Ligand binder design. Structure first.
Ligand SMILES: CCOC(=O)CCC(=O)O
Ligand SMILES: [Zn+2]
Ligand SMILES: [Zn+2]
Ligand SMILES: [Zn+2]
Ligand SMILES: [Zn+2]
Length: 263
């Protein structure tokens, strides 16, 4: 309840509520032409309802390789659970994970500093997160080392040649795709997960039979645990602990690793 946590939003969850295509909040959008010079723009998704309090925010980065598939589906799916979601446009000029990390941070800076007042009136600037696909997932990792005050990080089929992440202090949930040949889990996702501190709240979820572009298509297994991770760490909402610990065992999941329980 709200008494023990002022950041709780929405009714008490179930497996069904985390799997829902839309949560309890209706969602509005705001296009942004540019959030920083050189970095391009994106789309902000925000809950319309203000009567439960302000919300944390997640910036969402795409990958590098050409694909008309996108990150847009995360926008309303996640925002409708009570979050501000800023999907960042593709940018072929940013060809390194560190650049995508800086892009993620610039997007968050914009949200906090000078986004439309409708968004800022709904925003808790102290509770921010990053998520990204592929090189953008590498960027999520990079962003957390650059900004350890972030509340959560979700690298989706992440790609990064830097394999060492022992300095990450932000709760990190890595999603891998079994059949990924672009960011293979054996040399990307798994070494990232294993290098994160043993005392970090962390998880690794691998999707059975999934290709590299699985995160670009609506996927309930991804969504339900992304939602649960953001709830648990951006909102400190322990009502969502039930879905994260003990480890998920959904049929769609190849393997799950975690540092449960999350104190
Ligand atoms: C979507 C795949 O593209 C990436 O973001 C990672 C792999 C690459 O940089 O070629
Ligand atoms: Zn409570
Ligand atoms: Zn490193
Ligand atoms: Zn499998
Ligand atoms: Zn369950």
């Amino acid at each position: 309840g709200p008494q023990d946590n002022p950041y709780e939003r929405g009714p008490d969850p179930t497996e069904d509520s985390i799997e829902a295509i839309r949560g309890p909040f209706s969602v509005a959008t705001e296009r942004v032409s540019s959030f920083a010079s050189g970095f391009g723009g994106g789309t902000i998704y925000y809950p319309r309802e203000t009567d439960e309090g302000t919300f944390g925010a997640v910036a969402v980065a795409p990958g590098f390789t050409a694909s008309q598939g996108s990150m847009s589906w995360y926008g309303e799916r996640v925002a409708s659970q009570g979050f501000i979601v800023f999907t960042i446009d593709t940018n072929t000029r940013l060809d390194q994970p560190g650049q995508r990390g800086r892009q993620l941070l610039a997007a968050l800076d914009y949200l906090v500093e000078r986004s439309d007042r409708k968004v800022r009136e709904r925003l808790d600037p102290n509770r921010l997160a990053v998520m990204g696909h592929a090189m953008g997932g590498g960027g999520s990792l990079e962003a957390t080392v650059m900004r350890p005050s972030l509340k959560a990080s979700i690298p989706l089929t992440p790609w990064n040649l830097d394999k060492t992440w022992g300095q990450v202090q932000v709760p990190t949930f890595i999603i891998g795709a079994e059949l990924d040949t672009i960011a293979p889990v054996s040399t990307h996702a798994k070494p990232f997960y294993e290098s994160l501190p043993s005392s970090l709240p962390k998880a690794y979820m691998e999707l059975d039979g999934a290709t590299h572009f699985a995160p670009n298509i609506p996927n309930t297994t991804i969504a339900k645990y992304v939602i649960s991770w953001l709830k648990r760490f951006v909102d400190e909402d322990t009502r969502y602990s039930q879905f994260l610990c003990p480890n998920p065992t959904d049929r769609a999941i190849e393997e799950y690793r975690s540092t449960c329980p999350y104190k």
